[PDB]
A paper describes a structure:
Herein, we provide high‐resolution structures for an [name], from the predatory bacterium [name], which is controlled by a second signaling nucleotide, [name].
To gain insight into the mode of allosteric regulation, we therefore designed a truncation mutant (residues 1–150, referred to hereafter as [name]Δ[name], truncated at the point which the linker helix no longer contacts the cNMP sensor domain) that was amenable to study. The structure of the [name]Δ[name] construct was determined to 2.45 Å resolution, enabling us to trace residues 4–111 of the sensor‐hinge–C‐helix region of the protein. This truncated variant retains the CRP variant dimer interface observed in the full‐length protein and has two clearly empty cNMP sensor domains. Alignment of the bound and apo‐forms using the C‐helix interface (residues 97–110 of both chains) reveals that the cNMP body rotates ~50° relative to the plane between the C‐helices. Residues 81‐86 spanning the connection between the cNMP body and hinge helix comprise the fulcrum for this motion (identified using DynDom; Girdlestone & Hayward, 2016, labeled “cNMP link” in Fig 6B and C), resulting in the largest translation between apo and bound structures occurring at the distal end of the fold (the β‐hairpin element of the cNMP body shifts 25 Å, as depicted by an arrow in Fig 6A). The concerted rotation and translation of the cNMP fold places the outer face of the β‐sandwich (strands 1, 3, 6, and 8) into an orientation that would sterically clash with the linker helix of the opposing chain in the [name]‐bound full‐length structure.
Numbering used by the authors:
A (entry chain A): 4 to 111
B (entry chain B): 4 to 110
Amino acid sequence: AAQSVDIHKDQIIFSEGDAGDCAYIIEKGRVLIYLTKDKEEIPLTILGEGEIFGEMALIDNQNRSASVRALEDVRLAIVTKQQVLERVSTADKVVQLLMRVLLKRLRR
Amino acid sequence: AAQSVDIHKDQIIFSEGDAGDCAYIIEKGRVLIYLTKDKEEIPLTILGEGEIFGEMALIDNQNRSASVRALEDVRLAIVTKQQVLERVSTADKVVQLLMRVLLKRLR
């Protein structure tokens, strides 16, 4: 059962270093991917509706490489490891094979 | 129109260094992925029916990182950038987004 959550403007959705198991697809609003060094916000990217972030938690098994803050109220679809497996297994044969070898290459 | 090609036993399908625009799915036979150093064949992998290789040509169009020889008569399905785009565009939303970030990261 796919799930969604609301997060309010200016909330940090997650931070550089956090453990994470899931990715997020933006259904509403916008987020800023940023790092921080020195006590200084260094922005990388702004993402809006239809876009995914947090994806490396679904692939590898490390921590968040960047922090993400909501620039406005957001509604996020939670993508889990289980859902990925399920969707990939129902997908087109060629798309399957491609995802599977691309996923392997990205792992390392 | 999807296309296939027959490659005879011992034909080099492509080589380390070649420009390439497509990937292949093996419908028949087997192929050896190899490198060569000092005129010495160093085998990596044997691939057979149902498997894909050459996939990086669909990602970045830099040259082949390994050579591939048919060990026996093969039939390969040609996978083009256009076909991938078409299938990706009909696919599940989550599968779409995922493909798209794999392509982004592996360039």
